[PDB]
């Protein structure tokens, strides 16, 4: 029952704010040398009640998100553009985004206590 802020990574402007609904962090394992601890880790986040920033809406016509409960920060969040229409009209927009990781930084999410 916390709040999530979607911000532009470069400018820092708040793209939108919403309430978190669902988060999946599932990391699992063809792919003698030094053990490198290779892993395939992903984070998906479904968020609810998102109303976009009015200034950003006026401007629009990389992202980073901060989910604050203790204190979580996801850098490089890519919003999945899946769109499906219900025959029943529409009720709030739900935004799905996946956590991206840079090769050099090699970090996916940060938790602050």
């Amino acid at each position: 029952t916390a709040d999530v802020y979607f911000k532009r990574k470069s400018d820092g402007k708040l793209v939108f704010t919403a309430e978190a609904q669902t988060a999946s962090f599932s990391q699992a394992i063809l792919r003698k040398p030094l053990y490198i601890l290779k892993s395939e880790k992903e984070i998906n986040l479904t968020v609810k009640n998102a109303f976009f920033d009015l200034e950003w809406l006026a401007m629009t016509q990389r992202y980073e998100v901060e989910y604050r409960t203790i204190y979580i920060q996801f850098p490089n969040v890519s919003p999945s553009g899946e769109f499906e229409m219900s025959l029943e009209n529409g009720l709030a927009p739900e935004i799905k985004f996946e956590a991206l990781a840079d090769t050099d930084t090699d970090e996916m999410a940060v938790v602050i206590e």
Binding site: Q27, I29, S39, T60, Q61, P79, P93, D102, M108, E113
Partner: protein
Amino acid sequence: YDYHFEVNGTVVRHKNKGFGYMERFFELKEERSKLSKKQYERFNALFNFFEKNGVICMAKDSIEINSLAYHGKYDVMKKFIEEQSVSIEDDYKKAFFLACLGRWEESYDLYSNIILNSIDESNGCVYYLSQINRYRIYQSITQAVTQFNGLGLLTFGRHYKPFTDEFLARIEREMTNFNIDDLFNGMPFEFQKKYKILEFLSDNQFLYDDTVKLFELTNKVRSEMSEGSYSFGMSSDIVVLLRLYDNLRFLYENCLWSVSFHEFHQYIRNSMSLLIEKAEYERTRDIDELGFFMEYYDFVNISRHFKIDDIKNLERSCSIDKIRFGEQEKIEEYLVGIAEEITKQFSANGMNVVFYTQFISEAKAALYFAKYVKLSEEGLGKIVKALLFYFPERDLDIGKRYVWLERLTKCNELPKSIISIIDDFLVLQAEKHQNYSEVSSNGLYSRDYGALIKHFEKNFISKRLSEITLCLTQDKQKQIDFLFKLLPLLSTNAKSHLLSFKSVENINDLMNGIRIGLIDEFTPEHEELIIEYLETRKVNYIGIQTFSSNDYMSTFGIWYFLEEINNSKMEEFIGMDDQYDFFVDPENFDYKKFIPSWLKNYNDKLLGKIAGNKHMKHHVIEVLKERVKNSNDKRYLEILMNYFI
């Protein structure tokens, strides 16, 4: 309600009390010459109808869907659209096909024109269906516009505006205060008494009957699978499949746009993925003391109406590798067609956004499920070329696209043409690297493509990347350390040239050198670098606690465990996180902090060494028994039978 009709093709007696008409009708179907000539011709017409729709006989004693929209013949529908319609009947399917290709404005206008021209229609069925499809197009346009003003800004970056403002204004205007629940009631009473069975089509929720029936059938199937009972007559699973195929054929053959809405996709994904679970339970069923295979149609259904996360969930729930795959040639043709469309669109000026949202969601599922089907070399070349170059990167990033590629690689070992295609992709990525970063949601960057290439050749040398390395200069850092991760692909001269400027400054370069295989044992310099980074990590640690997924710390702990590190300074760094104290000093780990999810990440060698510790085996065996008894992941259990860690 005089008779009751099962999906099998048999009729059952409930309510008609007078003389039985179909009883005599079926026996007449099985001396019919005594009827009149007009009786004979209408009986011919009925016979054609009833055997067309599958009503074969009564109870006492596969499907095909003939539609271009279901098969994704996305050029044949275009050819149909360009052709002039002789009759309004051909104009209905043209409007449906126009709808299927985005282009919802033209579909709406054509549906309105069919409505205008349906004044002289004999029955009015086409008029009512056109009205339903026009409302479906209207809500489709409304939701798409809402998305483009919403999600269409986050995604795509820009504002698209596929429908003009005047067009939106007029369609909001004529659609104002339009109640579909009244649409069937607002029809001539002849139409209502004749087309009574289209009434369920009217309401804004028409699949609730089907969804409820599927809920009941799914509950019954789950009850049988929990009890272990054996169905002898028509199994409830077979009933699910029959009502399935009946529904797909009804809403695809009759050209309804409602097939493309979220409710129908949900109905499909719940009706499907339950036959699969029932099949897997049937396979894994013990013998007592007293198979189902998917076809091209099922492949299309899963490719279209299943989301990537939902296919992931179903493959997690049940194993699919033991389900045999038939009609593989048709599946290959469908996949090659999908790849051809995405190439012909993105490769040439991009593709229209309205058709993009409809196409790409099912394209994900098709290419993801393509792992399981066996494909020819030409088909694999086409689909790999489509997925690498001409697929929109905004959805499947480098890491997830690599997972896609290795999935299509599982069934068919990599041929030389596919490796050439991946070499071209890697060359393109190399020339992409500017202040450009290869970010990925999956963490499997471009080096994994080269790793796959070397895994399937072990002697492949990429010529163009070698020449790029030869022309590399010290000014350009991103390309140099990008090709450093692609070291095994380069030639010997390229390796020597790249090693001139390549230095292990930070430990990330050390990881890259290890992965490429440049480092096989730790020199004192590498050990000193590791210790220095650990020093600064603790220095910054001491002051709230912060946990990151950098995971290098656990890698250092594992290196200490496998004796690859032989310097006794590691114990000073104990306490800054878990999974490091687990390996360095396993006896003093206080396993109340142990996380069972760790064992999945480790490989055969690591967990084999962990098995041989025997001063640490029992705590992890307790964790493993708890997980196996509690969870149904079946990977922890597989670990358990493998080596009982």
